[PDB]
Swiss-Prot record:
UniProt binding sites for NADP(+): 31-32, 58-59, 77, 82, 160
A single GO cellular-component term on record: mitochondrion
Family of the protein in this entry: Belongs to the NAD(P)-dependent epimerase/dehydratase family. SDR39U1 subfamily.
General remark: Despite its name, it shares more sequence similarity with the sugar epimerase family than with the short-chain dehydrogenases/reductases (SDR) family.
Pfam short name (any one): Epimerase
Tissue-by-tissue expression: Expressed in adrenal gland.
Function: Putative NADP-dependent oxidoreductase.
Gene Ontology MF terms: oxidoreductase activity
Protein name, per record: Epimerase family protein SDR39U1
Keywords: NADP, Oxidoreductase
Length: 295
């Protein structure tokens, strides 16, 4: 198969590319910057969709980035970067003469209302109660193709844990130094997935032609944030006793982003499991042990 990966230079994208190649597929990236093995957004809009059997979009301004203040400008970039790139790919697919057989988008579990009691699956309602839930709705809308010529999948992802980027990029050194611990009360649900398993789900979506619709990109786990901190400390052989108060996380990230850190959704990957996909790292300990033992 030949796969076009929008935003594929990134964290998830790099893992997805390695797995796709390993499984016998050719990959072309869409990127803001030109180069080998890739085309630019400007080029896609100009001359259209290159030959491909399947397409994925991962493109997005980084949300968690502590170096940017949560203002309206940054908000506009978070939203615009995702809708525009997604829409551009969608329109390119619709007007391609030999359109691709599959089209897969990654969005987020932010769709589901954070709660200490609720339980969500892929059929659960949401997308309408805060900025990030509204984002996911519009984002998915931007991807939606009419017609059945191209198989459509949306993977709503939890926190993607892996070596060499993402959230672990920010957490790994402090935890290694004994500065880790729970965020807030620690009671909040921690929806997570090992990068290998997000990469795997996406690949399965691309390969298996019975897969359609929404899939929750989360390990079938019930971790809370307190359980995450403790398991991560154990895996590194370190003290992880230092709580981050809510006020401090809000100070650094802002009220709105802080939601992603201080609160959580219990998310079940019901439909994901129903696709026949089988997790390499379903249990949190095993996942963090892989990350910790390889550095
Ligand atoms: N924990 C996680 O990582 C989760 C991530 N997601 C989503 O998955 C997607 C990828 O995640 P991840 O790989 O971690 O993110 P990254 O930030 O590593 O990758 C994003 C890629 O998109 C491109 N990009 C960055 N900013 C912009 C912009 N303003 N406009 C266009 N393209 C941009 C970049 O490619 P280039 O420089 O080549 O243009 C970059 O390599 C994102 O949309 C994100 O919301 C969802 C749930 C969980």
């Amino acid at each position: 198969m030949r796969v076009l990966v929008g935003g594929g230079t990134g964290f998830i994208g790099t893992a997805l590319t390695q797995l796709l190649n390993a499984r016998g597929h050719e990959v072309t990236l869409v990127s803001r910057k030109p180069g080998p093995g890739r085309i630019t957004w400007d080029e896609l809009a100009a001359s259209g969709l290159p030959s491909c059997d399947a397409a994925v979009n991962l493109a997005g301004e980084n949300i968690l980035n502590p170096l940017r203040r949560w203002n309206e400008t940054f908000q506009k970039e978070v939203l615009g970067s995702r809708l525009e790139t997604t829409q551009l790919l969608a329109k390119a697919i619709t007007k391609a003469p030999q359109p691709p057989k599959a089209w897969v988008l990654v969005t987020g579990v932010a769709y589901y209302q954070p709660s200490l009691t609720a339980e969500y699956d892929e059929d659960s309602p949401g997308g309408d109660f805060d900025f990030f839930s509204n984002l996911v709705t519009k984002w998915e809308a931007a991807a939606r193709l009419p017609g059945d010529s191209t198989r459509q999948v949306v993977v709503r992802s939890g926190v993607v844990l892996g070596r060499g980027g993402g959230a672990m990029g920010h957490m790994l050194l402090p935890f290694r130094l004994g500065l880790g611990g729970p965020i807030g009360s620690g009671h909040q649900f921690f929806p997570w997935i090992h990068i290998g398993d997000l990469a795997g789900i996406l690949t399965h979506a691309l390969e298996a032609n019975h897969v359609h619709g929404v899939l929750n990109g989360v390990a079938p786990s019930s971790a809370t944030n307190a359980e995450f901190a403790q398991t991560f400390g154990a895996a590194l052989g370190r003290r992880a006793f230092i709580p981050l108060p809510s006020a401090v996380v809000q100070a650094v990230f802002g009220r709105q982003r802080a939601i992603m850190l201080l609160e959580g959704q219990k998310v079940i990957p019901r439909r994901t499991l129903a696709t026949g996909y089988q997790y390499s790292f379903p249990e949190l300990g095993a996942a963090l042990k892989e990350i910790a033992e390889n550095l």
